[PDB]
Amino acid sequence: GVVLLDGQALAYSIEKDLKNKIQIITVQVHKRPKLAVILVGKDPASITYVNMKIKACERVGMDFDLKTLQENVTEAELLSLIKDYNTDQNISGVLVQLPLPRHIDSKMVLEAIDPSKDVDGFHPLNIGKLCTQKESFLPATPMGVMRLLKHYHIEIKGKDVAIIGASNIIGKPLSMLMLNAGASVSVCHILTKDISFYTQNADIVCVGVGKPDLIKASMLKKGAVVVDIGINHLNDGRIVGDVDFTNAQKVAGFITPVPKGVGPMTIVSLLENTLIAFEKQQRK
């Protein structure tokens, strides 16, 4: 019997814990964790993502500051805003919604976030610490994937894991978390000659490239754990993953639905990182 990796249910359970911890903090020290969110421009999908993050903060009682900037904002203005958020002791985490406009150097803007407030885990200091087994902020999507697997008692150590997608924000950090946990890890992408070579061997397949039906049942090992990070908005309004869910469930042992699988876990991971940032700030 295949098991649904119910990321939505796990995220809601974690949110209940966050809400309770924040309630205690608010009464004990009369402060709350606070997330600063910067949105540049009016990209529809970016607006939706910002609203998802703000609504999540509201569900757990986390404070937030949403700063909306025009699409033609200068890099200097964005940097000056980030500097002020870095120095404001009442700001726990700082998040810049991506993508930024082409005239903005995204890597420079993200490196201006103080690493102690980098709740997205995108600062190279945090990425480098992850790669060298030093504790710091994990990117939210890989963090949520590992947390979901932990909840379902999926063993990582000694397992063969195939990661499809090699992005800086998902596939690469996820591969590092898997390796650090003792898996043998393959990272594939658009230039891979035969992804099925890697997926048919894998105990765990994680895919996040944005291509409907890329992962088919015939590409999987019987009993495999399948983590579908894709979120594809089809022309007709449907939202599907990168896995052929209907057929793959005939072979997989565990599988995330899309939507309501990895998505809610990414969001709750951002909330957890903001609380961690607050707690580390108070201890320092």
Residues marked as binding for NADP(+)? 165-167, 190, 231
Restricting to residues 55-94, which ones interact with Na ion according to CB under 5 A?
A: 83
- Exposed / middle / buried, residue 213 (Cβ in 10 Å: 0-12, 13-18, 19+): middle
Least distance in angstroms from the C-beta of 249 to Na ion: 24
Query: Does the footprint of Na ion cover residue 156 (CB under 5 A)?
Result: yes
* Nearest approach, Cβ of residue 159 and Na ion (Å): 8
Binding-site entries: 165-167, 190, 231
Q: Which is nearer to Na ion, 159 or 280 (CB)?
A: 159
Query: CA dihedral in degrees (163, 212, 4, 11; nearest 10)?
Result: 80
Q: How many residues does the chain have?
A: 284
Is 245:228 a contact under the CB 8 Å cutoff? yes
Stretch of 51-59, 148-156, 162-170, 247-255 contacting Na ion, by CB under 5 A? 148-156
In the complex with Na ion, which residue's Cβ is closer, 54 or 181?
181
Q: Cβ 155 to Na ion, closest distance in Å?
A: 4
What amino acid positions are annotated as catalytic residues?
53, 97, 120
Q: Which helix (H) or strand (E) holds 273?
A: helix 262-283
In this complex, which beta carbon is closest to Na ion, that of residue 28 or of residue 87? Answer: 87
Closest contact distance (angstroms) between CB of 127 and Na ion is: 22
Judged by CB, which is closer to Na ion: 76, or 234?
A: 76
Give the nearest distance from C-beta 183 to Na ion in angstroms. 8
Rounded to a whole number of angstroms, the distance between the first and last alpha carbons of the chain is 48
The residues with which 93 forms a beta bridge, in sequence order, are: 35
Which residue, 16 or 83, has its beta carbon nearer to Na ion? 83
- Contact assessment for residue 258 and residue 211, using Cβ atoms and an 8 Å cutoff: no
- The tokens 């697997």 sit on which residue? 149
155 binds Na ion (CB under 5 A): yes
The answer to whether residue 183 forms part of the interface with Na ion (CB under 5 A) is: no
The residue range among 149-157, 241-249, 251-259, 264-272 that interacts with Na ion, by the rule CB under 5 A, is 149-157
E-only strand ranges, the chain: 3-4, 34-40, 63-69, 93-96, 160-164, 184-188, 204-207, 225-228, 232-233, 239-240, 254-255
Q: Using CB under 5 A, which of 30, 153, 157, 193 touches Na ion? A: 157
Q: Quick one: tokens of 194?
A: 């035969």
- Residues of this chain that interact with Na ion (CB under 5 A) are 83, 155-157
